[PDB]
Amino acid sequence: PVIRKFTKKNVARAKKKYTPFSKRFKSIAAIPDLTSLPEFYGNSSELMASRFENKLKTTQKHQIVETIFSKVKKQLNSSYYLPARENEFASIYLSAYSAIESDSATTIYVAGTPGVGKTLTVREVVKELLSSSAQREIPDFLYVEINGLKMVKPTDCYETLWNKVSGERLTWAASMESLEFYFKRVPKNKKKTIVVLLDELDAMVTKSQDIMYNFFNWTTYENAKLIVIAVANTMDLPERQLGNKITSRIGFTRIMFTGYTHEELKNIIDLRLKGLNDSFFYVDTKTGNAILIDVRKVRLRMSADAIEIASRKVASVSGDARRALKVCKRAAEIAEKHYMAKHGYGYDGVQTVHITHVMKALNETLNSHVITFMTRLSFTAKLFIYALLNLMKKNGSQEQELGDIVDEIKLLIEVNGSNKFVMEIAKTLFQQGSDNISEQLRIISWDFVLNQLLDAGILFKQTMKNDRICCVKLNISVEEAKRAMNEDETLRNL
Amino acid sequence: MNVTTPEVAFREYQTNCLASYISADPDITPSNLILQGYSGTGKTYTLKKYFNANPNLHAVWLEPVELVSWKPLLQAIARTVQYKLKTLYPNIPTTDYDPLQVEEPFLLVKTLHNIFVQYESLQEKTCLFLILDGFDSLQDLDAALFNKYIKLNELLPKDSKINIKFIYTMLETSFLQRYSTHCIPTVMFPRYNVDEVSTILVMSRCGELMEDSCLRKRIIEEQITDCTDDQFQNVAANFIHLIVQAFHSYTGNDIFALNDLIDFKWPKYVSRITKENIFEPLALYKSAIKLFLSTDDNLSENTYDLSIISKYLLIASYICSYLEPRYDASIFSRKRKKKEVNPRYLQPSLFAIERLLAIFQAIFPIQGSLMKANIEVFQNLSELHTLKLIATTMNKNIDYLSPKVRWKVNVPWEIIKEISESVHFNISDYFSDIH
Amino acid sequence: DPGFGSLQRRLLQQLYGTLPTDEKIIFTYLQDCQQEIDRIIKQSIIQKESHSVILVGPRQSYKTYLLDYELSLLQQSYKEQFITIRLNGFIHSEQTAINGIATQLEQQLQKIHTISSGSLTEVFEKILLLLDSSITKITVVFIFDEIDTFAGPVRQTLLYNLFDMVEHSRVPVCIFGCTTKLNILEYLEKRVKSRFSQRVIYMPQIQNLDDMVDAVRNLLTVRSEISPWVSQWNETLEKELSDPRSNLNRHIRMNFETFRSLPTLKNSIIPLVATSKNFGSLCTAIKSCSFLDIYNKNQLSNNLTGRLQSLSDLELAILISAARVALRAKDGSFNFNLAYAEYEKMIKAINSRINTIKLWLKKDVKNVWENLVQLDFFTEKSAVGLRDNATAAFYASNYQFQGTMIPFDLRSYQMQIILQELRRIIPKSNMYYSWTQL
Amino acid sequence: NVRMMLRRSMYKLYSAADAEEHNDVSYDLSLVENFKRLFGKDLAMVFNFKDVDSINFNTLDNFIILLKSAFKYDHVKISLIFNINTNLSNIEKNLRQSTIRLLKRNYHKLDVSSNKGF
DNA sequence: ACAGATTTTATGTTTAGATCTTTTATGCTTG
DNA sequence: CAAGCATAAAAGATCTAAACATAAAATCTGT
Numbered sequence A: 001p002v003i004r005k006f007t008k009k010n011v012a013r014a015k016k017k018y019t020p021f022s023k024r025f026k027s028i029a030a031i032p033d034l035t036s037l038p039e040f041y042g043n044s045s046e047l048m049a050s051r052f053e054n055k056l057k058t059t060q061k062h063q064i065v066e067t068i069f070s071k072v073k074k075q076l077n078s079s080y081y082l083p084a085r086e087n088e089f090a091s092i093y094l095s096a097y098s099a100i101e102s103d104s105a106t107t108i109y110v111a112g113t114p115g116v117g118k119t120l121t122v123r124e125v126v127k128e129l130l131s132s133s134a135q136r137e138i139p140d141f142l143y144v145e146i147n148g149l150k151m152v153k154p155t156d157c158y159e160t161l162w163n164k165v166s167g168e169r170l171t172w173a174a175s176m177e178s179l180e181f182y183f184k185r186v187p188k189n190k191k192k193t194i195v196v197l198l199d200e201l202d203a204m205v206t207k208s209q210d211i212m213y214n215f216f217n218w219t220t221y222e223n224a225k226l227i228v229i230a231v232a233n234t235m236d237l238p239e240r241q242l243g244n245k246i247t248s249r250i251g252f253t254r255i256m257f258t259g260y261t262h263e264e265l266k267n268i269i270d271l272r273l274k275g276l277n278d279s280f281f282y283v284d285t286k287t288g289n290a291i292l293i294d295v296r297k298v299r300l301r302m303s304a305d306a307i308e309i310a311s312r313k314v315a316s317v318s319g320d321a322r323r324a325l326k327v328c329k330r331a332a333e334i335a336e337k338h339y340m341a342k343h344g345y346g347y348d349g350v351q352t353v354h355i356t357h358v359m360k361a362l363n364e365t366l367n368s369h370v371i372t373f374m375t376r377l378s379f380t381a382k383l384f385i386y387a388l389l390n391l392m393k394k395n396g397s398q399e400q401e402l403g404d405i406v407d408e409i410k411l412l413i414e415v416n417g418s419n420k421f422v423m424e425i426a427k428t429l430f431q432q433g434s435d436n437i438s439e440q441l442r443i444i445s446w447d448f449v450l451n452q453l454l455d456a457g458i459l460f461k462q463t464m465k466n467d468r469i470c471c472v473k474l475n476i477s478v479e480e481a482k483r484a485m486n487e488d489e490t491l492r493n494l
Numbered sequence B: 001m002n003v004t005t006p007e008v009a010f011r012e013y014q015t016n017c018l019a020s021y022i023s024a025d026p027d028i029t030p031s032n033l034i035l036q037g038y039s040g041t042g043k044t045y046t047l048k049k050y051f052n053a054n055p056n057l058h059a060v061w062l063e064p065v066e067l068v069s070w071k072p073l074l075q076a077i078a079r080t081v082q083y084k085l086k087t088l089y090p091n092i093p094t095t096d097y098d099p100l101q102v103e104e105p106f107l108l109v110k111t112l113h114n115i116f117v118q119y120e121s122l123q124e125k126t127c128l129f130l131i132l133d134g135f136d137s138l139q140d141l142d143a144a145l146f147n148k149y150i151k152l153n154e155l156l157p158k159d160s161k162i163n164i165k166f167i168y169t170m171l172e173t174s175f176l177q178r179y180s181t182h183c184i185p186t187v188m189f190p191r192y193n194v195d196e197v198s199t200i201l202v203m204s205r206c207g208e209l210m211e212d213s214c215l216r217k218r219i220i221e222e223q224i225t226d227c228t229d230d231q232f233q234n235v236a237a238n239f240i241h242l243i244v245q246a247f248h249s250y251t252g253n254d255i256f257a258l259n260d261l262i263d264f265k266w267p268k269y270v271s272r273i274t275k276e277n278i279f280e281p282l283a284l285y286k287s288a289i290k291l292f293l294s295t296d297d298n299l300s301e302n303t304y305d306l307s308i309i310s311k312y313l314l315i316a317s318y319i320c321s322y323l324e325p326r327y328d329a330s331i332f333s334r335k336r337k338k339k340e341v342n343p344r345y346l347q348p349s350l351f352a353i354e355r356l357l358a359i360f361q362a363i364f365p366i367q368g369s370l371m372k373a374n375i376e377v378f379q380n381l382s383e384l385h386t387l388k389l390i391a392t393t394m395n396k397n398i399d400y401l402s403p404k405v406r407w408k409v410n411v412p413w414e415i416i417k418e419i420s421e422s423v424h425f426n427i428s429d430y431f432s433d434i435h
Numbered sequence C: 001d002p003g004f005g006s007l008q009r010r011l012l013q014q015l016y017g018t019l020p021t022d023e024k025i026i027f028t029y030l031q032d033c034q035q036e037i038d039r040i041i042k043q044s045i046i047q048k049e050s051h052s053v054i055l056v057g058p059r060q061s062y063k064t065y066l067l068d069y070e071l072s073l074l075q076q077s078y079k080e081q082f083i084t085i086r087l088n089g090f091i092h093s094e095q096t097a098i099n100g101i102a103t104q105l106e107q108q109l110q111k112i113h114t115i116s117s118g119s120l121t122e123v124f125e126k127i128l129l130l131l132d133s134s135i136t137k138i139t140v141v142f143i144f145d146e147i148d149t150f151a152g153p154v155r156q157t158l159l160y161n162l163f164d165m166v167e168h169s170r171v172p173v174c175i176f177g178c179t180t181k182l183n184i185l186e187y188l189e190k191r192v193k194s195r196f197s198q199r200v201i202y203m204p205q206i207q208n209l210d211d212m213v214d215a216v217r218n219l220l221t222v223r224s225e226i227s228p229w230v231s232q233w234n235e236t237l238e239k240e241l242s243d244p245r246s247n248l249n250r251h252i253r254m255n256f257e258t259f260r261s262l263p264t265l266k267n268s269i270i271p272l273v274a275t276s277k278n279f280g281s282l283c284t285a286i287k288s289c290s291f292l293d294i295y296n297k298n299q300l301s302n303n304l305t306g307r308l309q310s311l312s313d314l315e316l317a318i319l320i321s322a323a324r325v326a327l328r329a330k331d332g333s334f335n336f337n338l339a340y341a342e343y344e345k346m347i348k349a350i351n352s353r354i355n356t357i358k359l360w361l362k363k364d365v366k367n368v369w370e371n372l373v374q375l376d377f378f379t380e381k382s383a384v385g386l387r388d389n390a391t392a393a394f395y396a397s398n399y400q401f402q403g404t405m406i407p408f409d410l411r412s413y414q415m416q417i418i419l420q421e422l423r424r425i426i427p428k429s430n431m432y433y434s435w436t437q438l
Numbered sequence D: 001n002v003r004m005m006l007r008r009s010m011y012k013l014y015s016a017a018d019a020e021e022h023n024d025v026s027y028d029l030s031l032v033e034n035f036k037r038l039f040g041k042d043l044a045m046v047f048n049f050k051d052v053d054s055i056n057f058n059t060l061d062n063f064i065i066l067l068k069s070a071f072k073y074d075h076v077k078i079s080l081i082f083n084i085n086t087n088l089s090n091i092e093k094n095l096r097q098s099t100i101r102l103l104k105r106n107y108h109k110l111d112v113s114s115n116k117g118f
Numbered sequence E: 001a002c003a004g005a006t007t008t009t010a011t012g013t014t015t016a017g018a019t020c021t022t023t024t025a026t027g028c029t030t031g
Numbered sequence F: 001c002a003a004g005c006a007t008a009a010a011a012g013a014t015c016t017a018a019a020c021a022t023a024a025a026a027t028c029t030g031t
């Protein structure tokens, strides 16, 4: 036997065939009815999803408690009639319906900022169009959702499509050629229309610039009956990635999504709480279980001004629906925490919310902690920050050699020999209190404090072997450090 | 807890702390520990003494110096842990895992978990110490490797019968401070004093020096049949003290270098021993005084085979490097003053090939023409460069022909000087301006 | 005596935190944070509600300990309703994270009652199909340590999947990301930030010295009947923590002002409480705290002045000469020949002032130079010590540095310790103190 | 660099030993540690540095120090051959003093050349 | 036509070669 | 002449593409 120059024993290769669909049938006239075959399309193999479903199921439960705000928290999540995206819904639905009843291939490229309903509205369009197809108004079709960012490698998205339209398992190259031959040579008589939702096209293109070209070119063929719904963040992704000539020779409907305004977000929140706002609940003081219409009737409502101010605050910065939903849910959670803090209901006469709770949640989301992180640091940390600020003010280079920091600290701690803190901090800071410890060149906690600041993302030190001349910058803005040092009680004295 | 503290020579506190931390009870033993200290500070020695004084607790000894990268380190960790567990409990029925199956830290986590679950029939909680002796001495070291081993203990099962505790060993005290905020208990090992190192050398070397065959041969040859082991111990201790007092200022406090010097100088010292000398401590010092003044640690027992033309090319290259071009014409008119900063102490300057050839022609003596540059001159220059004597100013893939490459001499003053006297060409003449 | 041995073992076990759960000592300043984390994890496991959270704080800020305490407390009663999957951002890379998640899923599923087989893409699709998709659902509680490595600059493939998974999937999911950076939200890209629950709870900090002394009292006061000495020892400690002038309180003040890290004080106390051989020794050592001073001296005994006091005479002379040359130079750089020239001028001046000092030769000062640069007193001209990660270290290993090829004499160095500090350290009685300044 | 020196040396050792003697082992110095157990024979490795002047002496010195660690086995003996071209002055100048001290215990200056002796 | 021989997809592992960026060794230049 | 001022080139961080390398599944070849 040979002697291996290096061994990889963790290799695991999937059982995927290599022969593309071109050589499978040996004749274009020999292609059978691909619509009705045992394995093609969604005609088999639904057992796997049922195999893993029972894996996480348990057989034990013990009197779960659903409080008054549990219903609100469960109905306000992002898991679940969209009113604010009706125009784009209608446009994309009209495009898809025209392409599906005319037996033609098209591409709809929709782009927008994260969390504005783009994926939700396209999924709603596909669901409604599938429901219409169930009424036998258009030829039947299969929906294949190919999420770009839910894949280990970008070239995976080919084989998935094949595995979802052909039941076979092929490698990415064989999948490419098989899909091209199926979209180019198979006659329209023996094919079923395919709708592909290339979610998060941004992650698919990267360095390859192959996925997007293949998917926007497969819709050009007349034989192919494909309706590619690509969705992305940047509106100019195609024209940049493919080039003006290609994006012109491919005619695809472009849609842009704008972030919701405050009125739209308020409407979304109100619609998601139509069944719970101003409702009567039966609650038992023994455990706190709430039942929707010792038992007490409690009225639950969410203040309109709180929703309005939350929507105004969240829409003015991003307009993302998910952030508004999450901040409202956090306000409800704060109210519920106060509820069991006052009552003590545990687990296993009008209750409402207030603008104070929403404001608390918004402040938690927005306000940073660096100004609060400095003010609770050790004395040596604030001394180090003070010396850094002093040297930055003196030199103006917004970066300082570390040995120069040490020298400034020593000078600062020796000039103020009469300050009421310094004469007793100097001993514990240079000799660590006890004798028998010689005068230390650096502070006692110098390495500890330097690493504490570097780890906390609050100070950047370039990598150098010479600890004397390595330079450190303040990642945080200089105003924060000055405010933090002003908040101290003894640093401002000296 | 109930562990025995061994008796070491000058590491009382270090061994007290080491016994305080290391213990056979995994509940009261830190999951990480660092014996930090420089070379010769005696940390492997005291650690080995501790682990030989408490055989009831088990350890695995590793040397990351031999395991250059991190992947061999992981593979060796897995293999040695498996082998030690098999040796300790041969009665447990266990399947083997190939040590070469681990290639990432996650695979090491999985392999350690799989080895530890199959040893679940142990009666009592057992801690296994994995001594990464020399972790900082890794040749593929980087800042983001130690903390992998720091946080490794979190990924292993909490309730497993066998718990692996790490005992690292680094020697830099600037690599350690990078992780100073991890607050992992550590035992810093200070260096050794002159008296301490002398005592250690006496303790660790008098037996070997007394039991030298050379000394026995010298005694039986010189016929001194009145001696005791006390006399030999005294003479060995006197030699150790003499060598320490004579070379401590030169060697510092490194025990290894002092051991090398002792091994080097003992044969001559014992060869200079005669009848009345041995019974007089000052006789050896006054008679073998040569050994104890000048150190001898170089290969030359106590130049270039280049051609004449290559030697002159080297001399011309050095002259070009260490002379200002604007002074070349004035100095070499062979057919405000000079600087006294002694540029021979600074890095050699960069010159051009044409200047080198011109000054080489200027300095070459007339034979039989001025030795017009021919194939031999250029071949000798290229051979000098491939000997790394005339280094260029560009990285690999060098092209000597581009008019953007410059040459600089790559020998110090000593080599070029003694080459100059080798060919009997004056070199402290053109540098007489700079003395 | 066995009583003191049992008390010592119990006390040191209390110090190390390995004390059994339901009686673990919890400090009074992180009780609020513990209640918050308990609220989150119980609201997620008991009520099967999925949500995410990122813990932030310095190293050894009691976040892994707090989460482990919560899991241990909640596992002794409700063990069949949740499976714990823990990833560490240091050892688990981007590719290996999927393998680790699959392995831990299959292991916990086997324990409570395949996935990991196949290629990595098959593994990822399998775990996604499994988990993303009267009785309840076994909640999968994720625990990310150092989530800032998974945060990444560009890809963020795993975080997006897991946050969309906690936002949209059916099985209840927790994900606790224990990271260090304060600006953790700036690391996550726009989509992952939108998916993230936008909830971060910051680790509490020691705001008052009273908090630290109360924490130390809670940590070091054994509160159970194990040994006959427990009745005595406790009150002793109380006395030592009642008088402000007491030595242990002074050391607590020192730690509060310098480190403000309780684990450092605990690592100091452990050898103090393990060295004592009887109860009298333990009492007198906790009264005197001499071993704390010994420990502090040992910790600092090797950094830069413990190093400096181990230099021999010639080594100190060469160090001083090199410092002189560095200070005289404009950029602080020097080399072997300049340092030796200054050293020989210094020794000649001293001898002319005159017992006789042997001016060591070049070939005998070369060894001192190598030892001095080996003790990290000098550094190369522009040399980076340790690279940030493995790729950069590999790139550097393949490259050939210029300073390596330059001969030994002409290698240009730089100084760790300036001449002024060298004067500040060296005692006045030393015979080189005259040349320690220009 | 040092790691590739070691990997090449261990690969050559394994290949030659297996060819003489007619599972796998990772390429590291522990192959020398396990050699007596693996092949039931003593070892004698002879390192021939072809052009010792061209190698940057930092990595050569590190490799020699690494090889020094292989003397705790009492069944392996090592022999080094340095194909020096210029003289020992450059070797003394470049190599660390500790490495020269370690080499000095057994060295043999052998003058082999076509131009020597006439 | 069944096991061996070759291929196809899928990495890991070193060597040779590239451009960016930072610093600093060169010139330009009055007396 | 040096300082100022400018461009220039050395030293190295950071990276990629190619040569060299192994390996498991599926295809292609002869009895």
Ligand SMILES: Nc1ncnc2c1ncn2[C@@H]1O[C@H](COP(=O)(O)OP(=O)(O)OP(O)(O)=S)[C@@H](O)[C@H]1O
Pocket (backbone or CB within 6 Å): A077, A078, A079, A080, A081, A082, A083, A084, A085, A113, A114, A115, A116, A117, A118, A119, A120, A121, A232, A233, A268, A321, A322, A325, C191, C194
């Ligand atoms: N028109 C709408 N009516 C009601 N709720 C909405 C509406 N649009 C968005 N939402 C809510 O906000 C969420 C947005 O989810 P998606 O639309 O999938 O996010 P997205 O816009 O695709 O962002 P990505 O995936 O980051 S590009 C929905 O799941 C709902 O919870």
Ligand SMILES: Nc1ncnc2c1ncn2[C@@H]1O[C@H](COP(=O)(O)OP(=O)(O)OP(O)(O)=S)[C@@H](O)[C@H]1O
Pocket (backbone or CB within 6 Å): B008, B009, B010, B011, B037, B038, B039, B040, B041, B042, B043, B044, B045, B046, B171, B200, B203, B204, B255
């Ligand atoms: N306390 C001691 N008592 C006796 N001998 C000692 C002592 N300390 C060191 N030695 C001697 O030192 C030598 C061993 O040195 P090591 O302990 O290996 O040094 P080291 O610092 O561990 O080496 P590194 O760091 O691994 S290069 C032997 O000669 C020991 O006898």
Ligand SMILES: Nc1ncnc2c1ncn2[C@@H]1O[C@H](COP(=O)(O)OP(=O)(O)OP(O)(O)=S)[C@@H](O)[C@H]1O
Pocket (backbone or CB within 6 Å): C016, C017, C018, C058, C059, C060, C061, C062, C063, C064, C065, C066, C068, C145, C146, C178, C179, C180, C263
């Ligand atoms: N398994 C454990 N059981 C009890 N206490 C522990 C355990 N592991 C660590 N600790 C203690 O936790 C404290 C250190 O804080 P940890 O939470 O462990 O680290 P951390 O705060 O998570 O820091 P990281 O991991 O670097 S972000 C010390 O008191 C440790 O002794």
Ligand SMILES: [Mg+2]
Pocket (backbone or CB within 6 Å): A119, A120
């Ligand atoms: Mg989406």
Ligand SMILES: [Mg+2]
Pocket (backbone or CB within 6 Å): B044, B045
């Ligand atoms: Mg050792």
Ligand SMILES: [Mg+2]
Pocket (backbone or CB within 6 Å): B151, B154, C064, C145, C146, C178
């Ligand atoms: Mg952790």
